[PDB]
Each structure stands twice: as structure tokens, then as C-alpha cells.
Design a binder for this molecule. Sequence first.
Ligand SMILES: Nc1ncnc2c1ncn2[C@@H]1O[C@H](COP(=O)(O)OP(=O)(O)OP(=O)(O)O)[C@@H](O)[C@H]1O
Ligand SMILES: Nc1ncnc2c1ncn2[C@@H]1O[C@H](COP(=O)(O)OP(=O)(O)OP(=O)(O)O)[C@@H](O)[C@H]1O
Ligand SMILES: CNC1=NC(=O)[C@H]([C@H](C)c2c[nH]c3ccccc23)O1
Ligand SMILES: CNC1=NC(=O)[C@H]([C@H](C)c2c[nH]c3ccccc23)O1
Ligand SMILES: [Mg+2]
Ligand SMILES: [Mg+2]
Lengths: 330, 330
Amino acid sequence: SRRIFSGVQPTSDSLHLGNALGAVAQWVGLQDDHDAFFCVVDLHAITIPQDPEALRRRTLITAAQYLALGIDPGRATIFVQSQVPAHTQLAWVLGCFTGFGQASRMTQFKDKSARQGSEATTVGLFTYPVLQAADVLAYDTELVPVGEDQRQHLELARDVAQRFNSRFPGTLVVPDVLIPKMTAKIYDLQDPTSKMSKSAGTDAGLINLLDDPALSAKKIRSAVTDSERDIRYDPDVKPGVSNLLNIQSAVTGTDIDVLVDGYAGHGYGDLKKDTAEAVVEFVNPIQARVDELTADPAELEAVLAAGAQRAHDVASKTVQRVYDRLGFLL
Amino acid sequence: SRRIFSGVQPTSDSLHLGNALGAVAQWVGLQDDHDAFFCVVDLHAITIPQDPEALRRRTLITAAQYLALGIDPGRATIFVQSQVPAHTQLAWVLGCFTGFGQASRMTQFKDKSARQGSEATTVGLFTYPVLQAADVLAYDTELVPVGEDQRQHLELARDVAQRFNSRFPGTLVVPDVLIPKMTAKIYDLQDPTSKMSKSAGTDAGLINLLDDPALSAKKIRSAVTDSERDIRYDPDVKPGVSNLLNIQSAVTGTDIDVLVDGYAGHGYGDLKKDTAEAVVEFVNPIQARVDELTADPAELEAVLAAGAQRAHDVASKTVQRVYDRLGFLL
Ligand SMILES: Nc1ncnc2c1ncn2[C@@H]1O[C@H](COP(=O)(O)OP(=O)(O)OP(=O)(O)O)[C@@H](O)[C@H]1O
Ligand SMILES: Nc1ncnc2c1ncn2[C@@H]1O[C@H](COP(=O)(O)OP(=O)(O)OP(=O)(O)O)[C@@H](O)[C@H]1O
Ligand SMILES: CNC1=NC(=O)[C@H]([C@H](C)c2c[nH]c3ccccc23)O1
Ligand SMILES: CNC1=NC(=O)[C@H]([C@H](C)c2c[nH]c3ccccc23)O1
Ligand SMILES: [Mg+2]
Ligand SMILES: [Mg+2]
């Protein structure tokens, strides 16, 4: 079994290297010997105002990038969150076991609730960590492969599951968090100590999978480095250079230490071009797959339709189990 | 059509006079010329820890008291909230359009968040006004018959519906609130300026429908009055006496003004006995109906099973409408 669950929001027209290397690469490695549910979490997207035409299109292109990155619909379940009602059913129950102060200590919330503490925060922006917990717990998930930015959220999920099981033993699976080391955080290229996010202002440090490959290669060349002319791996001291080697290692397969000793005598310029070529060679097979999946959508549609059918059969059994323990009339 | 929705929590083994006169009496009058959905809102109950065996039993006895008070399963839909997944689906969406500060200004929340501001509040205790909005809006409700204690919650529902329709015109029905005048608030009998709630500490001022009728009549006799020996209706000055006449008027059908001029020359003692006899005559037909509904449950079960089927057909169409406007892949 070794049941796995993970999700990405359809908040943009393309994943970036952080999503692909910090999350989806780990999924592709897991799917062959784990029972895997990979979700496009469109209910999370609407915590921020969303254009309806874009939201539907980005939902499909997020699932398409899953397949383009190697997710295999014969080995794994891909589905759209909003199509499985159990997620919200479980999230209401779990919110009843979640401390108010526990939810207000979440970092995302204190960011937006900093400049406009009550003026611009919504309830959804306050409670989405509880819906994230329900996303995982509805599938009896044993392991959750995520980047480091999701760690605090999933500690909340584990705590609420243990609190619930304290009242009702053996109802929910408490999941283990699986965060990588090298690819745990792909950083911005114009700002080496800040996390590559879709909401970065200027995308000149952002590397989108479906962007024009020559533009992404132009951004890699413009990456902020240091001034030591020494190519080595020290992220605390060398944020830029360690990022680029981390990227090149991830898109190729070559260990960082092997890369570093090969870069003995080499300069940052050759490290940039080399990374730029590996990335261009990485994104080009993806863009061609996405373009076929976008142009011919009966294949993608059908994967998502089988996926939601399978996800509903699992997740609704969990809800019915939780409801029976709570004492609801069934 | 004139679509109606209203709900009561299964938080105790009996409704009291406030529920029956402040809410259910109004429903019985409406059901014959309105399209009515009457809900036992068991998802709201679990905002407070609930014994599973009691919660299931109180859910059934709340629906039984509906029928015992005159709700007619041929003219109205009775169902259990947790059995219709659209409620939580809509509540998540609506929370994304609800201001954080708007939800924290709700009175219930500031009560519990007063002594233990973050120590004892849960997310469910903070967000249930949003689930209450979804309860109403999922059925294209035109009118909501409630007591005065629900007014602030339903202003929130109306505001979030208008905010949602602002982005997506004509999606949600904005409901009108229908609060009575006389029976708007049945007060405690040992504390005439506080609202008869199931959580009153001492039930010596609380009049439960299914309590032993002689005990409820004993509590009516012990009602706090004044010391003016004058029987008249002035709730600001005469809180006790106006309560008792309000109760007697509601359980009989006789207008208060007609009662008052009949009580010219009479003392508070005769006002109490007279109320006690009217109540005893009121609760005894209810207890006999509930006792049959409890003892023989295939009838009740079947009403709730038809009710949830009908509620799901309506409420899921609303969700699918909201989801399509939002841009979710259907
Ligand atoms: N810079 C990053 N490096 C590594 N992993 C990342 C990075 N950003 C996001 N992830 C991971 O990608 C997955 C999807 O996260 P999510 O959908 O929130 O993307 P995001 O980049 O944070 O976008 P958004 O700005 O819309 O929140 C998660 O497992 C998350 O930890
Ligand atoms: N004292 C009262 N007088 C009149 N109506 C009341 C009174 N208390 C509750 N109601 C009405 O009864 C309906 C059901 O409310 P609810 O199920 O919350 O009951 P409650 O008496 O408040 O119980 P609880 O203490 O569990 O909240 C609502 O329409 C509410 O306005
Ligand atoms: C705004 N919502 C949100 N942001 C996040 O980073 C999480 C992600 C997208 C998420 C939701 N459900 C999940 C289940 C497993 C792993 C990540 C997520 O949710
Ligand atoms: C704790 N939840 C809660 N307390 C209340 O007074 C409301 C009531 C029970 C409610 C929920 N949904 C409704 C729909 C119509 C009228 C009242 C309610 O909810
Ligand atoms: Mg994110
Ligand atoms: Mg109440």
C-alpha cells in the first residue's frame, strides 16, 4: 500500500522549478512502489480572487504538467479536489478539533494579517491549513511528499489527527512528512535567499516550465552569484552558486559533489551556461507533452474522470467512518 | 415556491419553549403555503464536544419533536444536515468571501473568546456562522424563520451572498429574515432578562417540552415576578409577568391584550396556575407523539430518508452552479 497524497494549486499557467524539482520529481520516484493520489487542489486556489476562465484552464494545465513530468496514470491517481465532496466534509469536522490560536500561529496567516490584520484576511485564508489536513487524512495517507514550505501545515494535520484519534481511537491515519534535502527549496535567481514562488513580482528570477526555453536560459545567465570565482556547495555562504548546482544536479542526475570537482578550475559563467543548457533540455520534452495534452484533451479528461471516481470511493468511506464515530445518524 | 429554510441543533434531549414557540410554531404556520426545508443541523452540534450515543439519539428526537409540534412530512422536507454534502462544499466557498474581522465581530465568538481568547476557541466555533450561511443559501432560500438570537448570523449570510453575486450576478438567492415579535425571545423563568437556553446551568427556569409535565408546571409556579400585583404587558418594566403572558398567549391562541383585560383584578398566582395548566395541556400531546415516534422508528427513519434525498437533489444543483461560476472543472 504505502499510501501517498500530495497536491499543487492551479494558481498559474505554469509550474516552476521549485514545484517540479521540490515536489513532482519526488512523486515520480515514489509512484511506482507507493499507492499515490496526486491532486490539483483547486479549492485552495480560490482563497485569492481567481478569474473563472483562467482557473479552469490552469486546472487542466496543472494536471497536464503532472503527466508531462512523468506521473503515470496507470500507476497513480490524478484528480481535481473540488470534484470530491469528502474533502470539505472532513475539513468541517477537523476544524471542530483545531485550536483557534493553533491556526492563527500559522506563518502564511501572520504575513497577510500583518499589514491588514483583519482588513484583508478572509476566513478561507485563515482556515485553508485545516482543508489541507482533510485533503491528506481523507485517503488514509501514510506519507506526504512536500517541500519545506509545507512542513508547518502538515504538523497541524498530524496534531489534529492525533487529537481526533484520542477521542476515537484508530479512526484516522497519522501521516509521515517526507521532505527532500537537496531540492527542499529552489530559490529565486535574482534573490538567492528567497523562495521561488509564482507571486514573486518580477519573474526574472523565476523559471517556469512552460516559458519559452530561450527566455528561461536568459534568466539563468542573469543569476546573481558572488565574487569568489570558486564553484562549491555552501548554501549559507554561497546562496546563488549552490542554487544553480542544485538545479543542474536535479535536472541531470549527477550528484553535486561529482559536479563540483568537475567544476574545479571553472568559472561561474560556465556554470550558468551549463545549467541553462540542462534546463532547456529539461523543459523542451515537457512543453511538447503539454502542448499535445492541451491540444487534444479527451485523454487528460478521462484520466481526471477515472481519478475522481477512485478518489471518491476512498475518501467517502473515510468520511462515513469519521461520521459514524462522531455519532451522526447515517 | 416561497422557499423556506430553518434549523435546530440536536444539542439536548428536548427542545424548550423558546425553540417551540420562538421557532417551530412559526414553521407550522408557514409550511402549508411555503416550500419548507427543516433541518436538524447536527454538524453545528459538534462545535462543542458531543457524546456519540447521545448525539445520534438527540438527532432523532429533534426530528421527532418537529413532527410532534405539527411539522407535516407531506407538506415539508425534514432532513439531517450531515447527510447532504453540499452544505460543507458551499461553506468552504463562502468562507473565501467572508472577512476575517467580519467573522470575529460575531457575538457568540466574543463571549467564548473573552475568558480564554485563543485558549478555548476552535476553528469550528469561529466559522460556524459561515456554515449557517451555506445551510440557507444552498436551497435558494427566500425566507428564514428564526428567533432574534439568529439575526446577526443571517445578516452575515445576506452580506456574503451579495458579495458573491457582485462577482457572479444572479447565482445565489439573498434571503429575507423573518423574526416574530411576541415570541421573538422566551425568557428564563428564574431570570426574566436572560434567554431560555439549553445551557442555563440550573434548569429551574427552563421549560423542556419532554420533561415531566408536573415538573414544568412546578417551575412555572416558581417563576420570578415583581411586586406590583398588576397583570399587564410591559417587558421592559415587567420582565417576568410579560414572559408568562407571552407563553400563555402562545400555547393557547388568545391575544395578550384580551388576556390582560381578563386578568383585571386577578393576581400573579392565578396567572401562574393558568399558564401552568395551558403548558401541561400543550406538552402532553407532544410527549405522546414523541413516545410513539421513539418507540417505532421506521416512520421517522423514512421521513428523514426521503428528506435527505430531496435536499441533496436541490442543494447539489446550487453547488454545481456556484462551482461553474467560480471556474472549477466540472
Ligand atoms: N520554491 C520551492 N521549492 C521547492 N518546493 C516548492 C517551492 N514552492 C513550492 N514548492 C512545493 O510545491 C508544492 C506545491 O505548492 P503550491 O501549489 O503552493 O506552489 P507555490 O509555488 O507555493 O505557489 P503559490 O504561490 O500559488 O502558493 C508543495 O509541495 C510545495 O512545498
Ligand atoms: N429563548 C429562545 N426564544 C426564542 N427562540 C429561541 C430561543 N432560543 C433559541 N431560539 C431559536 O430556536 C432555533 C434553534 O436554535 P438553537 O438550535 O441554537 O437552540 P438554542 O436554544 O440556542 O440551543 P443551544 O444552547 O444548543 O444553542 C433558532 O431559530 C433560535 O433563534
Ligand atoms: C492556499 N492553500 C495552500 N497553499 C499550500 O501551500 C497548500 C497546498 C497547495 C496543499 C493543499 N493540500 C495539500 C495536500 C498535500 C500537500 C500540499 C497541499 O494549500
Ligand atoms: C453552533 N451553531 C449554530 N448555532 C446557532 O444558533 C445556529 C443555528 C443552529 C443554525 C444553523 N443553521 C441554520 C439555518 C437556519 C437557521 C438557524 C440555523 O448554528
Ligand atoms: Mg504555496
Ligand atoms: Mg443557539
